[PDB]
Amino acid sequence: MDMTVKKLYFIPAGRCMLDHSSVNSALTPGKLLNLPVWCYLLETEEGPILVDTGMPESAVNNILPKMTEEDRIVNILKRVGYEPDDLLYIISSHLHFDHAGGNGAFTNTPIIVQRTEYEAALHREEYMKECILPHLNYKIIEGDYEVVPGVQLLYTPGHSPGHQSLFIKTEQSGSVLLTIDASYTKENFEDEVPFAGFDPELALSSIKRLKEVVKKEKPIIFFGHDIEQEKSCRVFPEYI
Ligand SMILES: [Zn+2]
Ligand SMILES: [Zn+2]
């Protein structure tokens, strides 16, 4: 039997303001939403694994990032009690600025990223250099992938060219699906309400596949940028 994740920690990593049409493509532009940015820390038998790394330090006190010094991944690292080199793996759901802005902090740890995301970040205009530094220890994968027992990546392209979501089994909670940006909000997922993405058609098929996973596994699901779900989540220092 595969080991489960001992602890899954949800870690607030600042906020980002967007037009409300980002979460529902049918909404009339001109109203702001202030969305939560997340990273997640997984304590496993082989060691700690970090999913996403927050926003670039250039966003501190500066799409409108709402980021303070506290939200920098290394200050997050300080609060969880780890140095960058303690991490077994970094997992990048994708290389958008609110998910990979802290990547440069990890220069030894393998950073798991989808080939289509990595290759897109080398060429596409929307990618900030902070998110695609050339000499990090990239572990480039393609498609679904087991990172360690209890931690699996589901390839969910659409929102970005190589976006990936997480399927985890934890000791306390059992099966957990972290959609990340494969669905910002519950309704993007359940009701297939269209939202901001590189390839909405592909995003929809990725949602459909996640639905097949949900039918089989009946996991608890946590969405990428959901202000309604946000405050009822147990967050660091609590875990699930
Ligand atoms: Zn994104
Ligand atoms: Zn995002």
Curated annotation (Swiss-Prot):
Q: Which E.C. number(s) belong to this protein?
A: 3.1.1.81
Q: Does the keyword Metal-binding apply?
A: yes
Residues at which Zn(2+) 2 binds: 98-99, 181, 225
Query: What is this enzyme's catalytic activity, as reactions?
Result: an N-acyl-L-homoserine lactone + H2O = an N-acyl-L-homoserine + H(+)
Top-level taxon in the UniProt lineage: Bacteria
The protein's required cofactor(s) are namely: Zn(2+)
What InterPro entries does the annotation carry?
A: AHLLactAiiA, MBL_superfamily_lactonases, Metallo-B-lactamas, RibonucZ/Hydroxyglut_hydro
Q: Enumerate the CDD domains for this protein.
A: AHL_lactonase_MBL-fold
Alphabetically sorted, this entry's keywords are: Hydrolase, Metal-binding, Zinc
Binding residues for Zn(2+) 1 = 94, 96, 159, 181
Q: How is the cofactor bound?
A: Binds 2 Zn(2+) ions per subunit.
MF GO annotations:
acyl-L-homoserine-lactone lactonohydrolase activity; metal ion binding
Going by the record, the broad EC class of this enzyme is hydrolase
In the record, the note on similarity to other proteins reads:
Belongs to the metallo-beta-lactamase superfamily.
Subunit info here reads: Monomer.
Function, as annotated, reads: Catalyzes hydrolysis of N-hexanoyl-(S)-homoserine lactone, but not the R-enantiomer. Hydrolyzes short- and long-chain N-acyl homoserine lactones with or without 3-oxo substitution at C3, has maximum activity on C10-AHL.
What's the name of the protein? N-acyl homoserine lactonase
Q: Which organism is it from?
A: Bacillus thuringiensis subsp. indiana
